[PDB]
Amino acid sequence: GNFCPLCDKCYDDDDYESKMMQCGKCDRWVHSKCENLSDEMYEILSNLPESVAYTCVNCTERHPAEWRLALEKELQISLKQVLTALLNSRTTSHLLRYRQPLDLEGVKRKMDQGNYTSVLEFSDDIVKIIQAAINSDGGQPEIKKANSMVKSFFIRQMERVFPWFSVKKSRFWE
């Protein structure tokens, strides 16, 4: 019988819906619900498991656990990858870098200080900035065309780095 070490429940009869992660050292599985992990962090881990190298309680050596540090780090590197891509675009930067962060520079300062703890927080901050700009940059034709280009560029960057994340469903899009 294969049991989750954190609830002691056998998972042999667990249905497909049971979200779990595998320990890379002993191949045993652990329920996401039994671990200190949010839905987001579970998906980040599951999208690229080898980057975190999760280890169960029986195989974990140090505290805090190495996998936890690795996963936290991964989140930060991923957020930075998205912001860097946006800032490296002249047009996007022109429109959004310089005007709760109110511009991309504000997001950069908040991020560099390691203040972002979730993808949704980071995403919403940026969606709000983009939508605010779209709502206020006027009606010049080139501006109208750029508005859609910028929104799409952001969505593409988020889908590349966080494919499991619903950026299109942000409550802050109008």
3-state helix, strand, coil in the chain (%, to 5): 55, 5, 40
Shorter beta-carbon distance to Zn ion: residue 41 or 107: 41
Task: Rule CB under 5 A: choose which of 7, 10, 48, 69 binds Zn ion.
Answer: 7
Q: Is 169 exposed, middle or buried (0-12, 13-18, 19+ CB in 10 A)?
A: exposed
Instruction: Tell me if 4 contacts Zn ion by CB under 5 A.
Output: yes
CB of 21 to Zn ion, least distance (A): 11
User: For Zn ion, which stretch binds (CB under 5 A), given 24-32, 83-91, 93-101, 143-151?
Assistant: 24-32
Kindly tell me which of 59 and 132 has the beta carbon lying closer to Zn ion: 59
Closest of 82, 79, 63 to residue 114, by C-alpha: 79
Note the residues at the interface with Zn ion (CB under 5 A): 4, 6-7, 23, 25-26, 31, 34, 56, 58-59
